[PDB]
């Protein structure tokens with residue numbers, strides 16, 4: 001139970017759209033729900049936008065910290081030139097993955113997110129300048145052995161990216177759309193037999 005309330009030095013939900021779990025630190029359990037995108041049943045803009053450059057790092061904060069076992073992933077989606085970040089919600093197949101982590105394998109799986117509040121998100125240097133939504137996700141897998149058991153902790157930040165390139169990420173995905181409840185990284189027993197591989201849900205990480 002954690003929120004993703006802040007980016008860089010900003011306050012709770014300042015550059016981050018106010019997630020539906022802002023009070024209860026709850027989760028999304030339905031990968032087909034509109035909440036799977038930005039944890040908002042009804043889209044509502046953040047009051048501010050974070051300025052950053054392509055190639056820089058954005059810090060995404062979890063609160064209190066990430067403590068359920070499972071992967072952290074970040075996605076981005078570009079607002080079209082003729083659109084306002086405050087009213088654009090990332091409909092359709094517009095999302096590309098910019099970060100994912102992987103567990104280490106042994107008698108038990110260890111996760112490179114556990115106990116952390118601060119997460120380094122690489123903004124790709126080669127993507128087009130413009131406004132973006134940045135989606136934060138952690139997938140709690142501690143009760144994910146049953147269908148609908150995975151717990152998604154999500155939010156989306158509003159970015160203005162400058163100094164970009166011209167590379168368009170291929171195979172963009174939709175939320176909902178990208179995930180199925182039976183995906184091997186979503187419907188999974190992490191405890192027995194302990195996995196020796198782990199397949200992150202969604203498309204491949206985009207790289208320049």
Ligand SMILES: *[C@@H]1O[C@H](CO)[C@@H](O)[C@H](O)[C@H]1NC(C)=O
Pocket residue numbers: 051160
């Ligand atoms: C962010 O960039 C915008 C232009 O899109 C500018 O008006 C604004 O002052 C900048 N904000 C900060 C905090 O630098």
Ligand SMILES: [Mg+2]
Pocket residue numbers: 001002068
């Ligand atoms: Mg919890």
